Design a protein around this nucleic acid. Structure first.
Ligand SMILES: [K+]
Ligand SMILES: [K+]
Ligand SMILES: [K+]
Ligand SMILES: [Mg+2]
Ligand SMILES: [Mg+2]
Length: 136
RNA sequence: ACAU
DNA sequence: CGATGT
Protein backbone atom coordinates (compact mmCIF):
# COMPACT_ATOMS: atom_id res chain seq x y z
CA UNK A 1 0.00 0.00 0.00
CA UNK A 2 1.83 3.07 -1.33
CA UNK A 3 1.00 6.75 -1.29
CA UNK A 4 -0.89 8.08 -4.31
CA UNK A 5 1.29 11.11 -4.89
CA UNK A 6 -1.05 12.67 -7.49
CA UNK A 7 -3.55 13.78 -4.87
CA UNK A 8 -4.76 16.64 -2.66
CA UNK A 9 -4.12 16.39 1.09
CA UNK A 10 -6.22 18.37 3.57
CA UNK A 11 -6.05 18.96 7.32
CA UNK A 12 -7.53 21.03 10.14
CA UNK A 13 -5.63 23.15 12.62
CA UNK A 14 -6.97 24.42 15.89
CA UNK A 15 -6.21 26.53 18.91
CA UNK A 16 -8.25 24.59 21.44
CA UNK A 17 -10.88 21.95 20.78
CA UNK A 18 -13.42 23.43 20.68
CA UNK A 19 -11.53 26.53 19.68
CA UNK A 20 -10.20 28.50 16.72
CA UNK A 21 -10.41 26.31 13.58
CA UNK A 22 -8.67 26.64 10.23
CA UNK A 23 -7.86 24.24 7.44
CA UNK A 24 -5.78 23.97 4.32
CA UNK A 25 -5.22 21.84 1.26
CA UNK A 26 -1.81 21.06 -0.26
CA UNK A 27 -0.34 19.13 -3.19
CA UNK A 28 0.63 15.78 -1.65
CA UNK A 29 3.87 15.55 -3.68
CA UNK A 30 5.24 19.08 -3.37
CA UNK A 31 3.51 20.52 -0.32
CA UNK A 32 2.38 23.57 -2.33
CA UNK A 33 -0.49 25.22 -0.47
CA UNK A 34 -3.54 25.31 -2.73
CA UNK A 35 -6.13 26.77 -0.34
CA UNK A 36 -6.34 28.03 3.24
CA UNK A 37 -9.50 28.91 5.16
CA UNK A 38 -9.59 32.04 7.31
CA UNK A 39 -9.72 31.10 11.02
CA UNK A 40 -13.20 30.43 12.43
CA UNK A 41 -13.35 31.62 16.06
CA UNK A 42 -15.06 28.54 17.56
CA UNK A 43 -15.44 25.05 16.14
CA UNK A 44 -14.34 21.45 16.63
CA UNK A 45 -11.54 19.41 15.11
CA UNK A 46 -14.03 17.18 13.32
CA UNK A 47 -16.10 20.05 11.93
CA UNK A 48 -12.89 21.51 10.50
CA UNK A 49 -11.77 18.20 9.02
CA UNK A 50 -15.21 17.86 7.39
CA UNK A 51 -15.13 21.37 5.93
CA UNK A 52 -11.63 20.75 4.59
CA UNK A 53 -12.70 17.64 2.65
CA UNK A 54 -15.79 19.35 1.27
CA UNK A 55 -13.76 22.36 0.21
CA UNK A 56 -11.33 20.00 -1.48
CA UNK A 57 -14.17 18.36 -3.39
CA UNK A 58 -15.38 21.78 -4.55
CA UNK A 59 -11.85 22.92 -5.45
CA UNK A 60 -11.18 19.84 -7.56
CA UNK A 61 -14.55 19.91 -9.27
CA UNK A 62 -14.13 23.59 -10.23
CA UNK A 63 -10.77 22.72 -11.82
CA UNK A 64 -11.96 19.54 -13.56
CA UNK A 65 -9.45 17.43 -11.61
CA UNK A 66 -9.94 13.72 -10.94
CA UNK A 67 -7.29 13.63 -8.18
CA UNK A 68 -8.18 11.86 -4.92
CA UNK A 69 -8.29 13.57 -1.52
CA UNK A 70 -6.33 12.33 1.51
CA UNK A 71 -7.59 13.08 5.02
CA UNK A 72 -6.35 11.67 8.33
CA UNK A 73 -9.82 12.01 9.93
CA UNK A 74 -11.77 8.76 10.17
CA UNK A 75 -14.72 10.80 11.45
CA UNK A 76 -14.77 13.38 8.64
CA UNK A 77 -14.34 10.75 5.92
CA UNK A 78 -17.45 9.00 7.28
CA UNK A 79 -19.41 12.25 7.61
CA UNK A 80 -18.70 13.09 3.94
CA UNK A 81 -19.70 9.57 2.87
CA UNK A 82 -22.99 9.99 4.80
CA UNK A 83 -23.48 13.63 3.68
CA UNK A 84 -24.14 14.37 7.36
CA UNK A 85 -21.82 15.98 9.97
CA UNK A 86 -22.83 14.47 13.31
CA UNK A 87 -21.18 17.11 15.54
CA UNK A 88 -22.03 17.54 19.25
CA UNK A 89 -21.04 21.22 19.34
CA UNK A 90 -23.72 23.37 20.96
CA UNK A 91 -25.49 25.93 18.77
CA UNK A 92 -25.22 29.46 20.17
CA UNK A 93 -24.16 32.89 18.94
CA UNK A 94 -20.46 32.04 19.29
CA UNK A 95 -20.74 28.79 17.25
CA UNK A 96 -23.16 30.19 14.66
CA UNK A 97 -20.46 30.75 12.07
CA UNK A 98 -19.06 27.20 12.08
CA UNK A 99 -22.50 25.68 12.10
CA UNK A 100 -23.53 27.82 9.12
CA UNK A 101 -20.49 26.61 7.17
CA UNK A 102 -21.13 22.97 8.12
CA UNK A 103 -24.81 23.27 7.20
CA UNK A 104 -23.81 24.82 3.87
CA UNK A 105 -21.19 22.13 3.19
CA UNK A 106 -23.79 19.42 3.80
CA UNK A 107 -26.17 21.23 1.49
CA UNK A 108 -23.51 21.30 -1.23
CA UNK A 109 -22.97 17.56 -0.89
CA UNK A 110 -26.73 17.00 -1.26
CA UNK A 111 -26.97 19.06 -4.48
CA UNK A 112 -23.75 18.05 -6.31
CA UNK A 113 -22.09 14.88 -7.54
CA UNK A 114 -18.45 13.78 -7.63
CA UNK A 115 -16.28 10.71 -8.29
CA UNK A 116 -13.33 11.97 -6.17
CA UNK A 117 -11.96 9.14 -4.04
CA UNK A 118 -11.64 10.19 -0.42
CA UNK A 119 -8.78 8.19 1.04
CA UNK A 120 -7.45 7.64 4.54
CA UNK A 121 -3.94 8.96 5.02
CA UNK A 122 -2.16 6.14 6.87
CA UNK A 123 -0.31 8.17 9.50
CA UNK A 124 1.00 5.06 11.24
CA UNK A 125 2.86 4.01 8.09
CA UNK A 126 3.60 7.34 6.41
CA UNK A 127 4.00 9.97 9.15
CA UNK A 128 2.01 13.19 9.33
CA UNK A 129 -0.21 14.19 6.44
CA UNK A 130 1.44 16.80 4.23
CA UNK A 131 -1.20 19.42 5.12
CA UNK A 132 -0.56 19.16 8.88
CA UNK A 133 0.00 22.36 10.88
CA UNK A 134 2.94 21.09 12.96
CA UNK A 135 1.23 22.14 16.21
CA UNK A 136 1.21 18.78 18.01
C1' A B 1 -10.16 -0.06 20.76
C1' C B 2 -9.60 3.21 16.51
C1' A B 3 -9.00 7.93 14.16
C1' U B 4 -8.08 12.74 15.42
C1' DC C 1 -3.30 16.04 30.88
C1' DG C 2 -7.91 17.53 28.08
C1' DA C 3 -11.46 17.52 23.94
C1' DT C 4 -14.01 15.47 19.36
C1' DG C 5 -15.90 11.47 17.17
C1' DT C 6 -17.08 5.95 15.41
K1 LIG D 1 -0.59 19.76 14.05
K1 LIG E 1 -2.97 12.87 12.89
K1 LIG F 1 -11.88 9.03 23.39
MG1 LIG G 1 -6.12 15.91 10.80
MG1 LIG H 1 -2.89 17.62 11.66
Amino acid sequence: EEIIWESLSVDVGSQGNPGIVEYKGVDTKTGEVLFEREPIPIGTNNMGEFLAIVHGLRYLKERNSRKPIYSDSQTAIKWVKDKKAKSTLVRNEETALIWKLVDEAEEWLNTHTYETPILKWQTDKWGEIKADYGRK
